[PDB]
Symmetry: D2
Subunit: 305 residues, 4 copies
């Protein structure tokens, strides 16, 4: 009746994901983790917030992969984040495990992968779970551009959502920031540079800040989880309510940008049947070079698993 | 304590405005009209929906301009729409004189959104008679017109309507300037979708003509536009009341931009807590600038007849 | 993929329903009516508001019952209101027409009837459409109590939703106002009478005002449309999102209150499967007497079809 | 223009508060704490979610009480919770003295919500050291406790959680008074469901114990709860900021009600635009009044140890 959202991974990102799912009355939630009491503690705390939010979403915790049965959405945040390339064979097992279960219990689910490096991890779980091309994507562009959009909006004093920006190729240090594609209220950013309301140095500074936003926060003695979770929930909500939002995520490339069996970030339309369109940007030569470097680094790491 | 929103005019647009204000819990509403029972009936009906909406907005009706007192937002839909069409301008001019007098006396610090058509003339008349500052009065135009264009495009490309961005400037009405160069989908230039054969240039020009004529398409179907107009006003009004600083295309006073002065015209603005916080001049090429000159010129033709 | 809501009747109530559906992104909308072009105009207007609402709901007009095909929710407001007892055989024939199509095109939909007298009509459409008891209900209690709730909240200066009240029996002049069941923020109304924050005379004034609110508004304007539409959408949203709200609605009585083979207003739970509970209030003898008068008047009108 | 909400304490509860404030576009957020850099990191993370939430709240971190300046809402979660628990009361008292000192100089006009436990003591201490009016400072308690009771009842009866109404008064903590007589489901007295055998009194008392112990149940599986407390505080704060006049059970100054004076205790109140607009004295029976008196007595015990 009501959709079943399984969070495979109940860390700080899953915590905020469960909170936002209840806030929006989006579906019943299973908080899975391999740690033994944490998800049931979080699920109990979170269940109570149904009262304050006027919702009726069940939130239960679990340590059994069997609770994936009948999942409509699976969100995978589980995986190692230290004790750097060294983690890839480890996270490669976790994807083999999860994919095995996905294949048996919820072969028909919509999968969002978050585990980093996401463009590698989403492909491994693609192959081991056997779900179709248009039912599995990785978080990346929505998060990266949310930072880029926000930093520009603060310089120009406009509402953050009114800045549009495109970040493609791959999530991470090789992300492709497409300066040509930035608009403010639908207006090309270059018009604001011409108007001296923002300088090219400031734009390149903001690009560097964007690329390093995860590390900026970690140095402040915290970690990014609120913005990633809201980004994940935006993609999941576009699926569950058939909104067909144009969102940049990591999807299977079958020729686009000149690359053919790797995952990369590109604008997509997320609708009720899943990925409904893959939109190939008409990049010029400089950008295709930076895109090719982004894909190349995805294949560097993929050859090491 | 809670903001006071006065709808000067309680027709179908004002009705949906009050309904949406209750849904969004935006503030107390006075539904004004010169007709004797219509606003009081609508307000009673609408007040009850606070229960379903989990809100606490008071909604009362009035036939007295004295209820403008202490208004924080004033929305003016009052005016004649028929009894060849320029003939209405002296009539609606006199209505703006009256409303402006009361605004000046009762809520001189209000934020004014004018809707009465032709809006680019009407918003200036009420600007002049009410004496409110330049940055506290605007006219509906771009949000409504572009909402149609965005929607018609979004359905052709099977994407979410809000993901289409478009600017329509100059004036609300037949001379609206449709800036094909500025249309994006998911932040992507529309021309890439034409290049990809996802939509043709002929289809885009059909959509432009459909947009320019959308009010008449609906009137011919034996209905009239009010839902989309009301939603557009509440978006503009919500950006002011909650200080969102949205970039919205509206009719504002031009003091040089595009080469025009002492006239109102549609251009992107930032609506924040202090009113209009920026007036954004698009860098139009020569042909777009020519069509903009025609829209303003048509606003000045009509303004000379009041 | 996305739910299909067919508004059978595109008058002033259907107008606000389509608006609120787009506002809440609840589903695609068909505005049906027998007046010919008017619904296509209203839907066109309404469709554009998707942009302001950040939703994606298709909104089309229709003059063909064939668009009931695959409807997930059908909301019936259509029917004669002039040109009294004499309208009942006419509106019966309309329910026969609608029921015939519901039976052939969307037999598995959730039906909400509004056409008055609702407790008669929802029974007639129940029998001609053949839908289960629990997939069809009539508007009444949610709308009537909203008036009672609002007026109490304004005297006590509290948030209208924080007043709770039950109005049962039938929609219309014989509605049963259960003074014993009124709470404010969960507190019995009697405690506010004792505190002299409201008097029994004022409560009884509010009772008459509630009973006469439809006719009060008709005299200033027309029949009410904003609040009925928000009430129908509250009931319809409870179905579509499996919220399991306790709402007072007109349902088939199979013994409760001592009545059978008739529809009457009583608290029920609306969830993903439709009516999930019918809650029989433990009324005292005097309330049970006033309930009998409401159903009795429902059957007198039903004998005149 | 836009409200300024200062979170004095940026732990796990404040984290969800900043998240929920951006989700609801309620105002700009200052995440204060004495632990250093950590709040600026959390604020940076949280700021970005403005994009997904369609809102415009500034979210910054701070380690300086000078950022209380111009606060419209102050929410106090800071305080010692470890390193018997009577031993923490003079410590957490001196923190209230510090916060109160700054409140008096920088934001004497704010609406204060105190959470530091034991809340009914701390909210009184902060009341006296800041000098804010009685109706501009309250403590978290009832909204949170009843959320558990409501949720569990609704899960046995299979109804929407919000449709259960219940009052829990006296004090936040182990002496909380669970008023079974006041429990309704969709406005129907709970007893009707017991009579109908849809839930037994025996199951109800299990739910009562579970509610009293929910904090400890979660602490053993995890830590102190943070999602529901933050949603509860934000419900109270939104009711203030949007003038909803919701009836919420919170800790307020008692000036005679229930037979008690110069003490704070949990009771239903109305939170509106001016703060506390009503204090509702439940007409408790003798045994309920006995349990209420015990809650205040335990608050007075701990207050005598500062
Ligand atoms: N000191 C210590 N004890 C641990 C650690 N991990 C597990 N234990 C204890 C907890 C239990 O008493 C026991 C078995 O744990 P297992 O996770 O079932 O070992 C650890 O890292 N340090
Ligand atoms: N037939 C008719 N009567 C009208 C019309 N307008 C007003 N009246 C009546 C209604 C009242 O009885 C009277 C005075 O109305 P006034 O709006 O106060 O005139 C109209 O257009 N036609
Ligand atoms: N154009 C037109 N609309 C009508 C006519 N009769 C009723 N309506 C409108 C009023 C309502 O919005 C809707 C349904 O009519 P019913 O009388 O409720 O159509 C008519 O003859 N012509
Ligand atoms: N367009 C149009 N609509 C009509 C006419 N007569 C009635 N209507 C409207 C009002 C009626 O309730 C509705 C359906 O009528 P039909 O005769 O079943 O259409 C007419 O001549 N033309
Ligand atoms: N990095 C760091 N964080 C701390 C330390 N002590 C507490 N915190 C965190 C936990 C909470 O999120 C917040 C407030 O601490 P308090 O102990 O509740 O800061 C510490 O010594 N170092
Ligand atoms: N970075 C840092 N934080 C500390 C240190 N000691 C304590 N803290 C954390 C936990 C304390 O509750 C908080 C404030 O401590 P201060 O001594 O008032 O900061 C320290 O040496 N370094
Ligand atoms: N489940 C758990 N996981 C991790 N640390 C735990 C734990 N339970 C207890 N601890 C830590 C905190 C305690 O101070 C410490 C010693 O606890 P013993 O039960 O004495 O172990
Ligand atoms: N409360 C705390 N949280 C996180 N890191 C801490 C901490 N206290 C100390 N550290 C860091 C400081 C050192 O780099 C490291 C080990 O410190 P020891 O005092 O050796 O841990
Ligand atoms: N306030 C009003 N405004 C417009 N028409 C009205 C009206 N009150 C009544 N009517 C119309 C509808 C009635 O059929 C018609 C004759 O009404 P008399 O009260 O007989 O006038
Ligand atoms: N109920 C109705 N609503 C709207 N227009 C109507 C109508 N009934 C008739 N008309 C139109 C038909 C003609 O164009 C005009 C005048 O018609 P008379 O019967 O002359 O009004
Ligand atoms: N067969 C039918 N199905 C649905 N609605 C009908 C109907 N016949 C009439 N109506 C509606 C349209 C109007 O609101 C009213 C009848 O008015 P017309 O003048 O027939 O009821
Ligand atoms: N305000 C009004 N009061 C009375 N009759 C009115 C009126 N406006 C229009 N009419 C006429 C138009 C039609 O000839 C006739 C139709 O009345 P009802 O819709 O049956 O009434
Ligand atoms: N003066 C003060 N103001 C606010 N919070 C304080 C404070 N002193 C301590 N705290 C908080 C920070 C921690 O959460 C806890 C004390 O732990 P530290 O190890 O001192 O209480
Ligand atoms: N799970 C755990 N159980 C017990 N001690 C732990 C622990 N994780 C870290 N510690 C150590 C680190 C510090 O030396 C010390 C601090 O304990 P409390 O925060 O006072 O405990
Ligand atoms: N008290 C704490 C908690 C976590 N941490 C750090 C080290 C852990 O490996 C890491 C866990 O991150 P989590 O999982 O997202 O956080 C810490 O240093 N001190
Ligand atoms: N052991 C330590 C290390 C750093 N610090 C302080 C120094 C700076 O103010 C801040 C930076 O620490 P970290 O390294 O990012 O924390 C501390 O208090 N104790
Ligand atoms: N109580 C403390 C002490 C240090 N720290 C952090 C601050 C520094 O950035 C970091 C340095 O660790 P170490 O010393 O290298 O530890 C902390 O978070 N809490
Ligand atoms: N009090 C604590 C202890 C550990 N942790 C863990 C959760 C994550 O693994 C990590 C980083 O969270 P922090 O908040 O950025 O520390 C925490 O968040 N709070
Ligand atoms: N029954 C009706 C009601 C209105 N109308 C038309 C003519 C009126 O001048 C016009 C009123 O529009 P409103 O004001 O937005 O609608 C009609 O033709 N028949
Ligand atoms: N007097 C009239 C005129 C048109 N009509 C019908 C013809 C078409 O079906 C429709 C279009 O009318 P209008 O002109 O847009 O209404 C009518 O029933 N009576
Ligand atoms: N009962 C009626 C008759 C005509 N009409 C409409 C159909 C036509 O488009 C419009 C004008 O008709 P006239 O003939 O020009 O009136 C209506 O809506 N209801
Ligand atoms: N039943 C009626 C009568 C008049 N009207 C008026 C209100 C407006 O002035 C005009 C057009 O509204 P319609 O809905 O598109 O008709 C109406 O909407 N409904
Ligand atoms: N002026 C007009 C136009 C159409 N009509 C009639 C022709 C059709 O029989 C009826 C429906 O027209 P519509 O087109 O569906 O209206 C009329 O009576 N008068
Ligand atoms: N490794 C370090 C570095 C700084 N510190 C001290 C220096 C200052 O007294 C205090 C604050 O550092 P931060 O930089 O604000 O931390 C330390 O204790 N250990
Ligand atoms: O002369 C008339 C009579 C009715 N109508 C309208 C009202 C009727 O319900 C519809 C269709 O009826 P007809 O197709 O039998 O047309 C019309 O347009 N012209
Ligand atoms: O040696 C130490 C001890 C504490 N701190 C932290 C914890 C203290 O609360 C803060 C500020 O205290 P200080 O400025 O008196 O610094 C530190 O940085 N170094």
């Amino acid at each position: 009746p009501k959709p079943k959202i399984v969070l495979v991974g109940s860390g700080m990102i899953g915590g905020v994901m469960a909170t936002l799912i209840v806030q929006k009355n989006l579906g019943d939630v299973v908080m899975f983790d391999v740690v033994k009491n944490m998800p049931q503690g979080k699920a109990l705390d979170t269940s109570h917030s149904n009262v304050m939010a006027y919702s009726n979403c069940k939130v239960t915790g679990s340590n059994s992969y069997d609770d994936l049965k009948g999942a409509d959405v699976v969100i995978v945040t589980a995986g190692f984040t230290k004790a750097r390339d060294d983690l890839l064979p480890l996270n490669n097992k976790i994807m083999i495990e999860i994919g095995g279960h996905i294949k048996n219990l919820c072969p028909n689910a919509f999968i969002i992968v978050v585990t980093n490096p996401v463009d590698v991890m989403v492909q491994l779980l693609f192959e081991h779970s056997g779900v179709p091309k248009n039912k599995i994507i990785g978080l990346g562009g929505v998060l990266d551009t949310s930072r880029l959009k926000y930093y520009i909006s603060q310089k120009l004093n406009v509402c953050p959502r009114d800045v549009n920006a495109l970040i493609v190729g791959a999530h991470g240090n090789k992300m492709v920031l497409l300066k040509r594609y930035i608009t403010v209220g639908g207006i090309p950013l270059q018009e604001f540079i011409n108007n001296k309301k923002i300088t090219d140095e400031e734009v390149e500074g903001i690009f560097d800040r964007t690329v390093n936003t995860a590390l900026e926060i970690v140095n402040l003695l915290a970690s990014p989880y609120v913005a990633p979770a809201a980004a994940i929930i935006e993609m999941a909500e576009s699926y569950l309510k058939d909104i067909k939002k144009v969102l940049v995520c990591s999807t299977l490339l079958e020729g686009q940008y000149g690359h053919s069996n790797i995952f990369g970030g590109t604008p997509l339309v997320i609708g009720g049947t899943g990925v409904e369109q893959v939109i190939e940007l008409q990049l010029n030569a400089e950008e295709k070079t930076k895109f090719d470097e982004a894909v190349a680094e995805t294949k560097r790491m993929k050859a090491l698993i």
